[PDB]
From a paper:
PPARγ (peroxisome proliferator-activated receptor gamma) is a transcription factor of the nuclear receptor family that functions predominantly as a heterodimer with RXRα. PPARγ is a key regulator of glucose homeostasis and adipogenesis. The recruitment of coactivators by PPARγ is primarily determined by the interaction of coactivator LXXLL motifs with the receptor LBD. Helix 12 is key regulatory structural element in the activation function 2 interacting with coregulators.
We then used biochemical and biophysical analysis to understand how three mutations located in the ligand-binding domain of PPARγ (M280I, I290M and T475M) promote PPARγ activity. The two other mutants of interest here are localized in the Ω loop of the PPARγ LBD; M280I is in the helix 2′ of the Ω loop and I290M is in the loop between helix 2′ and helix 3. The PPARγ M280I LBD crystallized in complex with GW1929 and PGC1α peptide as a homodimer and PPARγ I290M in complex with GW1929 as a monomer. The conformation and interactions of GW1929 in the PPARγ LBPs is similar in all complexes. While helix 2′ is similarly positioned in all complexes, the flexible loop connecting helix 2′ and helix 3 shows different conformations and is partially resolved in some complexes. For the I290M mutant, the surrounding loop connecting helix 2′ and helix 3 shows some flexibility as indicated by the poor density of some side chains residues and higher temperature factors. However, the structural analysis of I290M–GW1929 complex indicates that I290M interacts more strongly with I369, which contacts the ligand and may stabilize the β-sheet, as well as helix 3. In the I290M variant, M290 forms an interaction with Phe315 of H3, which interacts with His494 at the N-terminal end of H12. From the average structure calculated over the last 10 ns of each simulation, we found interactions that stabilized the Ω loop region via helix 3 and further stabilization of H12 activation function 2 for both the M280I and the I290M mutants.
Residue numbers in the entry: 230 to 505
Amino acid sequence: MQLNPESADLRALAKHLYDSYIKSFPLTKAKARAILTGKTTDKSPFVIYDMNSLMMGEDKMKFKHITPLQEQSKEVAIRIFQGCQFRSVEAVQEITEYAKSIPGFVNLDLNDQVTLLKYGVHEIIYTMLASLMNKDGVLISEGQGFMTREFLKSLRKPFGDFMEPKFEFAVKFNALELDDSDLAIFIAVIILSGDRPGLLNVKPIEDIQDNLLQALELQLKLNHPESSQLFAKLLQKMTDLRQIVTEHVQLLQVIKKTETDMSLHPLLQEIYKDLY
Ligand SMILES: CN(CCOc1ccc(C[C@H](Nc2ccccc2C(=O)c2ccccc2)C(=O)O)cc1)c1ccccn1
Ligand SMILES: [Cl-]
């Protein structure tokens, strides 16, 4: 391998994406792991590990109050539902801002830009959610709370099924030990998929993804020298991301049919509309 104009341009591309990733996503993997491993000495997340602690964390986590004369299981489900919805809407905006910085993206046909974001955002959301997870739980509300996996799993059906595929993915994904510099290129690779349904100009997207893939391959070689076949293993993880989306869509459809007063935010409806 040589540090020639080709590879140097790949490094400059990796740096450009890292810088735009830092600008677009306030809570990076580096900051989240610091919090999760207790490196933040003064301010620490409140832990939500059961019903009692969820209701004691209402103020810190922006949850509507739950009085003692309500169906506790139902109201908690609503709070978690609204909480995830708020976060997803914010996350779409961060990813959209990020995508505009991907070299070549803004030059694509505007309809193809929208199609790529439509099919990409949720896969990126689940990838970056893993940065905020360990086997115990997930950081929420800008890292001010930590909600446990078993608590999310105990919610009344169908709500208690929602997060488990995300945690199972995160544990395997986090064992790859990627850092923010790796992730910035990987999420660009997710976006620039030439196989999204309804793309008009496939060739310009593939040429960009080919370049991103080259950048990711070089990044992993330089940053993880003794991690054998890390590139291959990371690409296989895209298989799991797509299944997360598939199951999540199905669970949301159960909610649309068998639940009241939990309609999706309009932006999320537009993303899910005619998706696959
Ligand atoms: C666990 N979590 C971290 C963020 O988790 C996410 C988990 C999933 C998502 C994606 C997002 N999900 C929803 C969007 C709208 C309404 C509900 C959901 C749920 O996902 C949901 C549904 C039923 C029961 C529970 C959740 C999407 O599809 O756009 C985005 C974020 C929380 C929890 C409470 C408050 C804030 N943070
Ligand atoms: Cl290594």
